[model samples]
Target: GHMVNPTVFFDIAVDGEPLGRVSFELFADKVPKTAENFRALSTGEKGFGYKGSCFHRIIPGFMCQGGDFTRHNGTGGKSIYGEKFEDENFILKHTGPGILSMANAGPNTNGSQFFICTAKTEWLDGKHVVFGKVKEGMNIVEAMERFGSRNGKTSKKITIADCGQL
Candidate 1:
């Protein structure tokens, strides 16, 4: 508990219009492995990271998903550790908006995909690994609404122009 947690940032732009930077706190103490991977990816120290990635999925009144850096679509991305990482733990719960959690295909399949809750999501508490919460710049997150429900995925690109640690 003595080590300081990290805050990562995303310079977001939708359709080339800068939406500003959105920063979020990572819960390294509770999920160190999960948190650390995102921290490193944000800085792109390992190359091929969140930079240039885009939020591929958005469900208003729910959450927005992204971090599939490789494909810029929800179908791709690999963890800094490898193709996948086990769910660190679920001590953290999804209770309200701004919660950050991993997006996986199934059990123990966490990778470089994450989502930020736009509303309470208790249904995800035991399913997704809760890694952290948004620290600032949610107004930019709200921009997801512009794209609306992706009954089909958004054609307009909502990209992470850049990212790094804070």
Candidate 2:
């Protein structure tokens, strides 16, 4: 069957220097609600969005977490619908690098926070919702991972720069 999964692109930067672009194909066919939620937030249709946000948390060889445009920390963010949603289509596993998944406090609490896996994270399988994967700019993603590992502190300021549908 032909699917119409919409793809989104994110342009990242650090200290006003161009990083690169990372693209993801939203699994709208499998995870409809979650995909729509990300689509709305990514496109800035929901008012508060991902633009001008920073990747609040990052762990080398693990994942880079962000999408909290409101607080720029792991403590704040919300879905476009103004509420949390249950997990959807957990068919994909966190098998390796570049996995794009939702960041949640617990089960069924998906919101604006999401992460990009920088290495194999099989342990995350069935725990988080995997909705997409990185299509390009993994080198930049790796750089972000390294950037976060400096001095054992996760920088609270790796700007997202801009995001939109492609």
Candidate 3:
């Protein structure tokens, strides 16, 4: 069956100051299970999601990670399926910037944890499952990159102000 891809958006901010919104086009056709997990997490009908989560790990020019709503940090997050789900498929590649991929501890371990690349991450191609890409406001992602690049770290927090389906 043919189905249209889903779109989601996140209103981002750093230390409560608005950064911008980043929209994504989930690759449902390729990674159906992964995309649907992200979709439900965005809509958050399950009473938990990425809405108020903050980027717990941000590496400048590399990636920014979040989606640990349970702890508001990298330590926790549950999937729409359960605490974890097996990797749907490694069909997509993390070929460049702004690609969305799951941040897992090892194989067959995926939850709500995900990251967006800031530059070409060639080495990560088959390791992380790429399921989506940024459709709008990459400047916001770049803003996150800058936050991590600084030695002026006075405890900056990059939070998702809000997020949901478009």
Candidate 4:
């Protein structure tokens, strides 16, 4: 299999504490489409104006959600530009914990929302976009697995903190 690590670094921070850094390898391989979308938002002239956005849905053991290009965390927002195709050849196999994937209300609805699974979710196979794998920061993701502790509808500190290419 081919793999490509991001030419840059994206450090995830919480309250100014450095959490972890992730590679862009899986992104270039498994979910090129989603990766492109993230890249656009991260490096555009606007430069991820949606940073520190909310992780709207928070499900214990299942996933922690984010990518609400609209409202930052509300439902009345619009969707991101749709891609030409879905990578169906992609596998649903949960390689490890902290796997990042695209979120959708249904098939073909994927836009700017995604989630990192704190644990393996086999049942999510045909339902959502299993895009990228979390190269690092499983521990941080594990810490975030806890439910209802911070703020928002899910009562968690769910926020992007920051984002960028590589």
Q: On residues 1-166, what C-alpha lDDT tens digit does candidate 4 reach at each position? A: 5456444234555545666654333455656666666556544434343465666666775777776756766452223354424534445565556676766665666666767777678777767767666665666666556643333246435555666665
- How well does candidate 1 match the true structure in TM-score terms? 0.95
lDDT of 1 by residue, 49-131 (tens): 89988888887777888988877778899998876988889999998989999999999998899999989999888999999
Model 1: number of backbone collisions: 0
Sliding window of 10 residues with minimal summed lDDT for model 4: 76-85
lDDT of 2 by residue, 1-166 (tens): 7878988888888876778888888888877888888888889986878988888778786889998877877888899876888888689898899988999988899889999998889888888998888877788888778778733356535787889999
Decide which is better by lDDT, 1 or 4.
Answer: 1
What ranges in model 2 sit over 4 Å off? 150-152
Give the candidate order by descending TM-score: 1, 3, 2, 4
Clashing pairs in 4: none
Backbone steric clashes in candidate 2, count? 0
Which is superior by lDDT, 2 or 3? Answer: 3
Q: Would you estimate the TM-scores of all the predictions? A: 0.95, 0.92, 0.93, 0.72
Each prediction's whole-model lDDT (CA) = 0.88, 0.84, 0.88, 0.58
- For candidate 3, lDDT tens digit of each residue in 1-166? 6698999999998899988999999999999999999999998988888898888888886888888888876788989987688888888888889899998989888999999999888788778899999999888888777877543232588898999999
User: How does candidate 2 score on lDDT?
Assistant: 0.84
